[PDB]
Amino acid sequence: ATYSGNPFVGVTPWANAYYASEVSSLAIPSLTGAMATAAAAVAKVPSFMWLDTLDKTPLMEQTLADIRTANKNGGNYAGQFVVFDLPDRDCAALASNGEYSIADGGVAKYKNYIDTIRQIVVEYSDIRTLLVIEPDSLANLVTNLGTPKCANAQSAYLECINYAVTQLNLPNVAMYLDAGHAGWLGWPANQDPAAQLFANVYKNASSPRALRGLATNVANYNGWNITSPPSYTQGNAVYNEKLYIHAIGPLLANHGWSNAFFITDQGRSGKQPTGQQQWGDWCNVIGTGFGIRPSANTGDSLLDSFVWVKPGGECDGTSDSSAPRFDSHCALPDALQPAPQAGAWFQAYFVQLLTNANPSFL
Ligand SMILES: CO[C@@H]1O[C@H](CO)[C@@H](O[C@@H]2O[C@H](CO)[C@@H](S[C@@H]3O[C@H](CO)[C@@H](O[C@@H]4O[C@H](CO)[C@@H](O)[C@H](O)[C@H]4O)[C@H](O)[C@H]3O)[C@H](O)[C@H]2O)[C@H](O)[C@H]1O
Ligand SMILES: *[C@@H]1O[C@H](CO)[C@@H](O)[C@H](O)[C@H]1NC(C)=O
Ligand SMILES: *[C@@H]1O[C@H](CO)[C@@H](O)[C@H](O)[C@H]1NC(C)=O
Ligand SMILES: *[C@H]1O[C@H](CO)[C@@H](O)[C@H](O)[C@@H]1O
Ligand SMILES: *[C@H]1O[C@H](CO)[C@@H](O)[C@H](O)[C@@H]1O
Ligand SMILES: *[C@H]1O[C@H](CO)[C@@H](O)[C@H](O)[C@@H]1O
Ligand SMILES: *[C@H]1O[C@H](CO)[C@@H](O)[C@H](O)[C@@H]1O
Ligand SMILES: *[C@H]1O[C@H](CO)[C@@H](O)[C@H](O)[C@@H]1O
Ligand SMILES: *[C@H]1O[C@H](CO)[C@@H](O)[C@H](O)[C@@H]1O
Ligand SMILES: *[C@H]1O[C@H](CO)[C@@H](O)[C@H](O)[C@@H]1O
Numbered sequence: 393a394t395y396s397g398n399p400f401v402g403v404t405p406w407a408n409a410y411y412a413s414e415v416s417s418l419a420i421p422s423l424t425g426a427m428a429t430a431a432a433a434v435a436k437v438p439s440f441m442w443l444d445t446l447d448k449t450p451l452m453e454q455t456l457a458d459i460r461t462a463n464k465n466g467g468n469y470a471g472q473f474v475v476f477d478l479p480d481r482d483c484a485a486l487a488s489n490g491e492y493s494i495a496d497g498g499v500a501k502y503k504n505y506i507d508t509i510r511q512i513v514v515e516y517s518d519i520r521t522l523l524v525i526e527p528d529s530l531a532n533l534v535t536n537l538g539t540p541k542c543a544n545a546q547s548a549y550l551e552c553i554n555y556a557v558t559q560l561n562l563p564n565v566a567m568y569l570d571a572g573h574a575g576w577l578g579w580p581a582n583q584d585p586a587a588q589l590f591a592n593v594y595k596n597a598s599s600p601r602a603l604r605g606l607a608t609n610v611a612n613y614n615g616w617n618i619t620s621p622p623s624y625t626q627g628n629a630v631y632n633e634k635l636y637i638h639a640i641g642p643l644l645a646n647h648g649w650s651n652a653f654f655i656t657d658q659g660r661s662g663k664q665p666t667g668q669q670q671w672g673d674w675c676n677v678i679g680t681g682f683g684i685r686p687s688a689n690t691g692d693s694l695l696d697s698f699v700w701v702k703p704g705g706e707c708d709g710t711s712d713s714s715a716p717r718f719d720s721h722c723a724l725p726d727a728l729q730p731a732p733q734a735g736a737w738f739q740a741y742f743v744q745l746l747t748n749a750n751p752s753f754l
Pocket of ligand 2: 547550551554592593596
């Protein structure tokens, strides 16, 4: 379980039964022939399991139990999970608001949430556990303080995240703090303030040994190393994730965080350029496809691994204007509709990702 260097080396990312179930029971029954066979393969690509609700915690243990059994059979698997239940979650948007609110004892609930997770990780110390810490949180504090919900959630976000990284700082764990993406914090003007924030989180948590680095492009679609700038990236020299991590990495070192590495989500980056009409359009973007398969052989000094954090097929937000959590971004002309609630299965989107996959599944 313990490691030195890249935590993705020496182990094999586990493909969870939750996503496998969604594909096999919600997607495959609608497909046939070659498509049905390609879809089955997708369910075997390792992706991160999101602990988006406390009700998901028993699932985390079930997954780890499955992994323990598999490793008993010669398996050498590692678990992959996303810590994502901050109070007043997704402060700059409306589609992914969570079950906890700062106003109603949210910080206390979050700590309880973290305690539940730590106890499971402690019980499964024998399993290498790779974690992404709170996607879509700190990034908002850099550019969205103009939004009341974010402005008022600052201290809670920092307090909760510090509790998460300090409590989950165990020898069998590798944590990557979410760091937005190239089109968000990658812009030269947002680089330094972002690096300072992340570095202050790291130092404020007493430089946790388990905090290996940052996670980028989570739930987004930027290419990892595309060579030609898409039209929508006009103005930003940092137009892919490689350029982004190589730009911010040195800045992290300047602010007290040295030896920080990265992992980048490529689960929906296979088709470039995407169908985005505006770079800031993040909801159920059309013209995307499954991308680079998870692997530690990145050939890049800063990237520990390509990963699939956001599970392709699970929606980014509802396109129903009358539904709760409706975010106008999900009704844009470059967003695939009709779309279900965030997290819910979106068959048409799964098919789009499968059809436009690169590497191909067909
Ligand atoms: C200037 O750059 C732009 O900045 C804006 C911010 O002002 C960026 O917008 C933000 O983009 C984020 C993605 O890049 C999304 S995150 C969003 O919510 C969550 C992830 O945080 C996802 O939903 C969850 O998915 C889980 C797994 O499927 C489920 O378990 C869970 O139930 C779901 O809630 C969702 O897929 C993501 O889309 C921000 O909402 C958005 O404001 C913009 O990206 C920059 O370009
Ligand atoms: C440091 O940790 C404390 C713990 O209470 C937290 O309140 C504070 O917001 C953290 N500061 C930063 C910059 O993360
Ligand atoms: C981008 O990365 C992938 C995976 O390592 C690699 O196969 C491809 O050749 C790279 N493309 C460029 C232009 O470097
Ligand atoms: C935990 O223990 C293993 C086995 O000795 C090491 O390989 C690892 O570096 C860590 O010390
Ligand atoms: C994890 O499991 C994979 C099997 O796909 C191996 O190839 C790898 O070496 C590790 O044992
Ligand atoms: C397997 O699990 C998925 C995700 O919960 C379900 O959608 C499916 O119906 C089955 O129970
Ligand atoms: C869901 O189950 C099917 C078989 O029923 C698999 O082919 C798929 O990969 C996923 O595990
Ligand atoms: C998807 O979920 C169904 C139950 O709804 C199973 O029967 C199937 O085997 C797969 O796990
Ligand atoms: C899979 O997708 C088909 C449409 O192609 C539906 O009819 C089915 O209910 C499932 O969603
Ligand atoms: C998808 O393709 C496989 C062979 O590659 C078949 O065995 C399966 O029945 C489906 O047609």
